[model samples]
Target: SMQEEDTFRELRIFLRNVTHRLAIDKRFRVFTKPVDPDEVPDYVTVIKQPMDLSSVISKIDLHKYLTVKDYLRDIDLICSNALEYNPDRDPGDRLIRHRACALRDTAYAIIKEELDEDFEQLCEEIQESR
Candidate 1:
């Protein structure tokens, strides 16, 4: 096996479970797909790189996350985008921000559980090459 090859294959497995966990959260149903710029007029303007549960899942299928950090970074980015777009100072924004915060928090907890010496080695394989 290529030292580089299986590291990413395993990364995909971990990323898939993370996305699956995020998908099952009912509170985040609204964020399951990419935001439509047509519906939300300023969405594209405010957020340069849009992300959602579906997008993350799609990316995993494409095998882009050779490192665990990048996978988690996208999860963090999804939540941060929500917080940025909706300040939550207003009543309507509070719900969006709340879910975003919760989603990231949940994702972190999962990431924490998976981290150990073994996974660190996996992350390192991709890290040193690039």
Candidate 2:
């Protein structure tokens, strides 16, 4: 288990790094920029800026931030599938493990405004159970 504030801080750093990587990699075919609030509209600020999540998290305006459905769905799905075993493992353990790795790898490469602490805890707890 991790200390509460430390875990929060780590999560914040993880997300910030993810966003930065996504913005830099050209193959990903996405556009993003820094935190110049005036240059870019409020709706897309999550693409860049706030290089540190810990500071901006408290003031995050959800409506202005990007939606989870937009760029995070596939990674989110992979994380979810990594938990199920038993009959669901018919997909093959190799692929399941790969999905977990993909989620971890890709997740660390992108950022999100909303950090779901409980969901992340549940995911980690399930992974530990195995």
Candidate 3:
């Protein structure tokens, strides 16, 4: 079993990555409305974009971020929703369900190995800064 401290540390690193990307990456920001009436949206222009995660992070305490279990719950919910919406036994629905399951499984397999290494490096940087 994972120790409590290890779990919390890992959760923080995971949350940091999530928050960092959302805060810093423009791709995560979504714009539902047109910026200007005169300009028409081109193909792919209307896709959801990323918002600044820093301002969002500042507004709430980091303690409120989801834990590993909570993260898994979200993945399960997404997979469940995909199946629920495809109750007609359609070929397209199978494809969607397969993709969602594959993604969820693949991500979980890699999450800890990838993120823990990253967290160690980050800790080293903080150690150096002092």
Best candidate, TM-score-wise? Answer: 1
- What is candidate 2's lDDT per residue for 1-130, written digit by digit as tens? 4654454445545445565554455432212322345764652433322322222233222222232332255344334433432125455655545545554455544443445646476445544554
- For residues 58-129, could you state the per-residue lDDT of candidate 1 as single tens digits? 898997776777887898889989988888588779999999889988888988887565776767776776
What local lDDT score does residue 107 receive in model 1, on the 0 to 100 scale? 87
lDDT of 3: 0.47
TM-score of 1: 0.89
Which candidate would rank higher by TM-score, 2 or 3?
Answer: 3
lDDT per residue, candidate 3, 14-124, as tens digits? 655654543343322321122333553432243232212343343224444334444445445444554554456678767767755654564466565555655555544
Record all residue pairs in model 3 with backbone atoms less than 3 Å apart, i.e. clashing. 23-52, 23-53, 27-50, 28-49, 28-50, 29-49, 29-50, 29-51, 30-49
* Structural RMSD, model 1: 1.7
What candidate 3 gets wrong by more than 4 Å, as runs, is 1-12, 16-63, 115-130
Worst ten in a row by lDDT for model 1? 115-124
lDDT values, one for every candidate: 0.83, 0.41, 0.47
TM-score per candidate: 0.89, 0.30, 0.43
TM-score of 3: 0.43
RMSD of each: 1.7, 14.3, 11.4
Candidate 1, position 3, lDDT: 65
Ten contiguous residues minimizing lDDT sum, candidate 2: 56-65
